Design a protein around this ligand. Structure first.
Ligand SMILES: OC[C@H]1O[C@@H](O[C@H]2[C@H](O)[C@@H](O)[C@H](O[C@H]3[C@H](O)[C@@H](O)[C@H](O)O[C@@H]3CO)O[C@@H]2CO)[C@H](O)[C@@H](O)[C@@H]1O
Length: 321
C-alpha cells in the first residue's frame, strides 16, 4: 500500500570518496533495533540511499558481496518491522564522477546495474519501489532521460510489478520541474507503473544547506509554491508523483509552518513524501530527524499528524473523470 508519509534513512552512501570504504567507519547501515523505533512512530515507508560504486565496483560486474549483503540484511530488518523500502541509487546520474551515457559509463552499464538490483531483490517482501537514480544534475541533465529509459528497461527485466520512481534533471527540483520534465514524457515502461519523484528544500537557493535563517520576507507557502509546478505538471500530463526529499532545520517556527502547509498540499493531492532525513549516523546534522539526546525534532510531530490524515489508496494526483 502507498503511505503518504515516509522518511529517508541515509548512511549507506556516506563518505563517497572512500571506495569501497569500510562499513561502520565510512558508511552506515541501520543497526539492529533501528526500524523498530520508526515503526513504533507510525512511519512505515523508508527511502534508502545506496552508493552505486559500492554495490558494483566494476561496471557490468556482479554486485559486491559485502555491500549487497548489507542491503539484504536491511531489507530483512525492514520486513520484520513492517517497513516498506524504496531502494535509491543515490548517484546523481554518475558513476565514478562520469555521466551515464558518456563513453566512460554507457547506458548499458546502468541498465546492467538495475537488472542486477531487480534480480537480487524483486523477491523480497520489504522492497516497495525502485528510485532508480537520485538527483541528476549539471552535465548529467541532458543525458539523463536516455539513461532513465535504460534503468527502467533494466528493472523490468526482472521486476514487472513494482513502481519505478523517476527523478528529474536539476537535482530533481520540484520548483523547476516543468522546465525539463517534458523530456521524461518519452519514457516507456512496459508495466506502465512509473511515478515521478521531485525534491524540495525551502532555503532560498533550494539546496537544503539552510546556511541562513528564514529571513524577514519569508513566505510560509514557499514549500507549496515550489511543489506546485511539479504537481501541476503531473495533472497536466496525467502522471503520478512523489516527493523523495524534503527537510528543514529544527530551529525556527517559520520552517515548520512551511512544512505543515506543504504536507497539507501533498495530502490534498495524494503525493507521498520522504522526509530528508533519518539515519543511524547523522550526528548534529541540521536536518536530521533521528533521535539524538538533547536535540528537538519538531518535524516528526508534523509527519505523524499527517500520517494519521492519510486517506489515499494510490499515488496522486487524481485524474479528471
Ligand atoms: O549534498 C548531498 C545531498 O545533496 C542534495 O542535493 C543538493 C545539492 O547538494 C546542492 O548542490 C544543490 O544545490 C543547487 C540547488 O538545488 C539549486 O536550486 C541552485 O540553483 O543551485 C544549487 C547549486 O549551486 O541542491 C540539492 C538539493 O536541491 C541531494 O538531494 C541529496 O540527495 C544528497 O544527500
Amino acid at each position: 500500500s502507498v503511505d503518504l508519509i515516509g522518511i529517508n534513512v541515509a548512511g549507506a552512501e556516506f563518505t563517497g570518496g572512500k571506495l569501497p570504504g569500510k562499513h561502520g567507519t565510512h558508511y552506515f547501515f541501520p543497526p539492529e533495533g533501528y526500524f523498530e523505533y520508526w515503526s513504533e512512530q507510525g512511519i512505515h515507508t523508508v527511502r534508502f540511499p545506496l552508493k552505486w560504486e559500492r554495490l558494483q565496483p566494476s561496471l557490468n560486474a556482479e554486485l559486491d558481496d559485502v555491500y549487497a549483503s548489507l542491503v539484504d540484511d536491511m531489507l530483512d530488518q525492514a520486513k520484520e518491522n513492517d517497513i516498506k523500502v524504496i531502494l535509491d541509487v543515490h548517484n546523481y546520474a554518475r558513476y565514478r564522477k562520469k555521466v551515464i551515457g558518456t563513453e566512460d559509463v554507457p547506458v548499458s552499464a546502468y541498465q546492467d546495474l538495475m537488472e542486477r538490483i531487480a534480480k537480487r531483490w524483486q523477491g523480497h517482501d520489504a522492497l516497495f519501489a525502485y528510485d532508480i537514480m537520485n538527483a541528476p544534475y549539471g552535465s548529467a541533465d541532458k543525458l539523463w532521460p536516455a539513461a532513465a529509459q535504460a534503468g527502467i528497461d533494466g528493472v523490468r527485466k526482472y521486476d514487472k510489478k513494482r513502481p519505478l520512481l523517476i527523478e528529474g534533471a536539476s537535482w530533481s527540483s520540484a520548483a523547476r520541474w516543468p522546465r525539463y520534465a517534458d523530456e521524461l514524457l518519452k519514457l516507456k515502461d512496459p508495466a506502465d507503473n512509473m511515478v515521478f519523484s521531485a525534491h524540495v528544500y525551502i532555503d532560498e537557493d533550494a539546496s537544503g544547506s539552510y546556511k541562513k535563517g528564514p529571513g524577514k520576507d519569508f513566505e510560509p507557502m514557499i514549500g507549496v509554491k515550489r511543489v506546485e509546478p511539479f504537481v501541476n505538471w503531473l495533472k497536466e500530463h496525467g502522471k503520478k508523483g512523489h516527493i523523495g526529499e524534503f527537510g528543514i532545520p529544527n530551529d525556527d517556527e517559520r520552517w515548520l509552518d512551511a512544512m505543515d502547509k506543504l504536507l497539507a498540499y501533498l495530502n490534498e493531492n495524494c503525493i507521498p513524501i520522504n522526509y530528508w532525513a533519518a539515519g543511524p549516523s547523522w550526528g548534529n546534522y541540521k536536518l536530521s530527524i533521528e533521535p539524538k539526546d538533547g536535540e528537538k525534532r519538531p518535524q516528526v510531530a508534523l509527519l505523524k499528524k499527517y500520517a494519521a490524515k492519510d486517506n489515499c489508496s494510490d499515488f496522486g494526483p487524481a485524474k479528471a473523470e
